[PDB]
Design a binder for this molecule. Structure first.
Ligand SMILES: CSc1nn(-c2ccccc2)c2cc(NC(=O)C3CCNCC3)ccc12
Ligand SMILES: CSc1nn(-c2ccccc2)c2cc(NC(=O)C3CCNCC3)ccc12
Lengths: 301, 296
């Protein structure tokens, strides 16, 4: 179908099928057991954020890798069930579409996770070259294969140079994995998200420390953002003013899977609507907080 | 009577292959992944099929995408599926299988839906005239004992050369199952059952349990890497050493492979001794491979 120019928010990242089983007690290797319940669930950061963008009322698209098969089929159908445009998927002739097994111990809350295989090629810079950008008002990139992703950002930068300011594509990036190669991604984007887990691995004990201690790594004029779960979230821009919003805890915490992606998507959304950074931190915290008290993404409205 | 019928479960196996089992609450990356049509009766058809024996599966499926996969795989193997007891109240079973590549160990997390078990009422609708052998995965006793009843009846009215051979698998240590022991010319009991029931070895289990079989029936007990044993009406104990591959990589469906190969052998007129041995040969060969393709 036809996508009006400059209307869509794109997220580039991982889609994965999570098979989530609820057990009484962790299984002894080599046993056989009945779970209490078992859910198949579309997962992955970029993928979760797409869902949140649609439910919020943004037109949005996912770009990641998949391979023909029954897993992709279920994933594509779950994407479409959430109104996500999947026409930018990078279909692959080699490799398994990512699938993960997660086992949630019902008598202690602990998650044991068999994570997907590494067989499937990441979206590459040459793949991104073939994409007509005029669709997108905002492009958000989940840091994975950094050396390639840098080329994509450089290509968006090149596109932008020629556009009137009112047709520039905003860019955001997320570094959520404590992996040296990713750290070069700070240098890109108007908005850079850093996870609590990355901050800590770099030795920072709080949002504020993380921001003050990493802002030097981001490009001129960029905003750097760090959610710290129940401690809410900070952002730091060019003006050096450390911004903050408290959390919005829900009556009781049901499900936190994807709360971080929900917050990313919500900030992006608010910013893309022309709200202030401070207004967007708040909204982010409000939406992610609400979601944490619901199963899945259903009632975040 | 050209075909073999198996009566049990078909289950979607979502398989992860890992090089060590994850410590509780840890997170490990798997070597690779695949989907497999599994379930006992389902695995046996795979095996009979591979061995060259026309066969048919009879179990409860629920229409959907899962079933479309299962059915397609069934057919890709040449398994007659026309006897499937379709439903509308429940999903088709599935499970996660973590397969330790270092010792082929397999760990199974089963999601059992509502999908009710095939019933005598479904079975009484079966043209027994196509079947040389009928094998029954022991599940709902009460309701299957009737299925057996039907077969015993049908046999009375037939030449001692046109009778239908019957095998029963008693997989679970459940008391309801203790009565299937019971019927059939060949009774398979697993190591787990035997153990979960007071016995320390195949030889013991066969002595312990023989008193419960139909006159002239063979009691069979596999015992993993120790091989397998059998006991007939003549009271001579039969053993077969295992055939371990040099590298065990995937034992998912070993037992079922053993059962199918014994059944195949017996249905070709081989002696019980030859059948025990062929059973271990194929099960062993399969434990050296991921999946089933390549046993023959
Ligand atoms: C800044 S927006 C945000 N709010 N909350 C939140 C606030 C109050 C009560 C409950 C949740 C979050 C929780 C997580 N994530 C988790 O808490 C996970 C729990 C398991 N360990 C990983 C973190 C991620 C983001 C948020
Ligand atoms: C009698 S035919 C047979 N051979 N093998 C075999 C022999 C040597 C190496 C590997 C396998 C089997 C293994 C199982 N079953 C298992 O190994 C199970 C694995 C999980 N723990 C329970 C036993 C069941 C039957 C057989």
């Amino acid at each position: 179908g036809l996508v009006p120019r400059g209307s869509q928010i794109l997220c580039v990242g991982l889609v994965v099928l999570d098979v989530i089983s609820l057990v009484d007690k962790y299984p002894k290797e080599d046993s056989e057991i009945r779970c209490l319940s078992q859910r198949w669930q579309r997962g992955g950061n970029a993928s979760n954020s797409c869902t949140v963008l649609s439910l919020l009322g943004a037109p949005c698209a996912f770009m990641g890798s998949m391979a023909p098969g029954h897993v992709a089929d279920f994933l594509v159908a779950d994407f479409r069930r959430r109104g996500v445009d999947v026409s930018q998927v990078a279909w692959q002739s080699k490799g398994d579409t990512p699938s993960s097994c997660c086992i949630i111990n019902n008598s202690n809350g602990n998650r044991t996770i068999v994570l997907h295989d590494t067989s499937l090629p990441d979206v590459s810079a040459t793949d991104f070259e073939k994409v007509d950008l005029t669709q997108f008002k905002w492009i958000h990139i989940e840091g994975r294969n950094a050396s390639e992703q840098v080329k994509m950002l450089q290509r968006i930068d090149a596109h932008n140079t020629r556009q009137p300011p009112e047709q520039k594509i905003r860019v955001s990036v997320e570094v959520e994995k404590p992996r040296e190669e990713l750290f070069q991604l700070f240098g890109y984007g108007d908005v850079v998200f850093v996870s609590k887990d990355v901050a800590k691995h770099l030795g920072f004990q709080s949002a504020e420390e993380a921001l003050r201690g990493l802002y030097g790594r981001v490009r001129k004029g960029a905003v750097l953002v760090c959610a710290w779960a129940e401690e809410g979230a900070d952002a730091l821009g060019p003006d050096g003013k450390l911004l903050h919003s408290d959390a919005f805890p829900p009556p009781r915490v049901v499900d936190t899977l994807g709360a971080g992606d929900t917050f990313n998507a919500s900030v992006i959304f608010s910013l893309s609507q022309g709200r202030s950074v401070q207004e967007a931190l708040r909204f982010g915290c409000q939406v992610a907080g609400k979601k944490c008290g619901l199963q899945g993404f259903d009632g975040i409205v």
